[PDB]
Structure 1
Amino acid sequence: RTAVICYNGRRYELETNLQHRDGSDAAIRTLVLNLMFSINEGCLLLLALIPTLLVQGAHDGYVNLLIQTANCVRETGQLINIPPMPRIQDGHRRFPIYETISSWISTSSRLGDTLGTRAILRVCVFDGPSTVHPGDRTAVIQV
């Protein structure tokens, strides 16, 4: 704006509306900020493995499905290149990949709890029925 769902084999349609333009950008800024605090120095060594992930997606089965949805990794791995990385400043001491994948889980354990809502309860039916159809009371326990 500023520029169907399947579940258990059943489709639904959304009726979500945008009646103004302030909350849209209050969410866009958070999306872009959290999308911007993920990139780091060690990310380039992960970026050089795209031609190798492309061959492991042809050698394996689980990776060949992961590569289809990656609408970027599937396009860069045959269209862009990178020369080898420079020598790590004080490389005898530190480790960049540990940094780039330690400071990556934080900004992902928050992306849900900021673009949406947290989880407050979870269904624990000790002796009641197993599943719950629309309109039937459950037994929950707060998180």
Structure 2
Amino acid sequence: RTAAADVICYNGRRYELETNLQHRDGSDAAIRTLVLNLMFSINEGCLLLLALIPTLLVQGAHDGYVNLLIQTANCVRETGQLINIPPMPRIQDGHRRFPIYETISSWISTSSRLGDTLGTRAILRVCVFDGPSTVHPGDRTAVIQV
């Protein structure tokens, strides 16, 4: 809406999404966080992680679950077939530091806190001790706070 699907399947059930945004400032207030956290993910070792795309393709040919994973990725299926990365230059002081450690440690942090910023955290967890197994819509539960 700011620049210019509403159904979600869960346990084999289709529930339509009727969201609305009657104005515009909450929108970009969210988008700024989205892009901000999107930026701090890429790092030095992303170059090495990029030349590994064709290995992921040949594994997508070699194994089976990789075939489920590769085709929902609307980007990797194109780049490894339409983008190339030449021999990466040597990393400055390559005998002391290590790039992949950073490019993968600064993604665990930025990922857990992601959804709890565009949304909310989980405060309670259903722990039925001796009641029923599952819970239907509208039944009283038993819980302990997170």
Report the TM-score range of the alignment, normalised by the length of the smaller protein: over 0.9
Residues in 2 aligned to 1:127 and 1:78: alpha-carbon distance in whole angstroms:
55
Report the structure, 1 or 2, having the larger helix content. 2
1:49-64 mapped onto 2 (5 Å cutoff):
49-64=52-67
Tell me the secondary structure at the aligned position of residue 82 of structure 2: coil
Unaligned 5+ runs, structure 2: 1-6
User: Which residue of 64, 85, 89 maps to 2:88?
Assistant: 85
RMSD between aligned residues: 0.5
Partner of 2:11: 8
Residues in 2 aligned to 1:82 and 1:134: alpha-carbon distance in whole angstroms:
52
Partner of 1:141: 144
Provide runs of 4+ in structure 1 moved above 2 Å: none
Deviation (angstroms), 1:62: 1.0
Unaligned 5+ runs, structure 1: none
Tell me the secondary structure at the aligned position of residue 144 of structure 2: strand
Percent identity reads 100
Deviation (angstroms), 1:71: 0.5
Tell me the secondary structure at the aligned position of residue 141 of structure 1: strand
Partner of 1:31: 34
For 1:22-60, what per-residue CA distance to the aligned partner results, in whole angstroms no more than 9, with x for missing partners? 000000000000000101011110000111100100100
How many residue pairs align between the two structures? 140
Deviation (angstroms), 1:121: 0.1
Residues in 2 aligned to 1:130 and 1:141: alpha-carbon distance in whole angstroms:
16
Tell me the secondary structure at the aligned position of residue 61 of structure 2: helix
Residues in 2 aligned to 1:110 and 1:69: alpha-carbon distance in whole angstroms:
24
For 1:9-34, what per-residue CA distance to the aligned partner results, in whole angstroms no more than 9, with x for missing partners? 00010110001000000000000000
Deviation (angstroms), 1:84: 1.1
For 1:108-130, what per-residue CA distance to the aligned partner results, in whole angstroms no more than 9, with x for missing partners? 01111001010000000010001
For 1:64-100, what per-residue CA distance to the aligned partner results, in whole angstroms no more than 9, with x for missing partners? 1100111000110100101011111110011100000
Residues in 1 aligned to 2:109 and 2:23: alpha-carbon distance in whole angstroms:
31
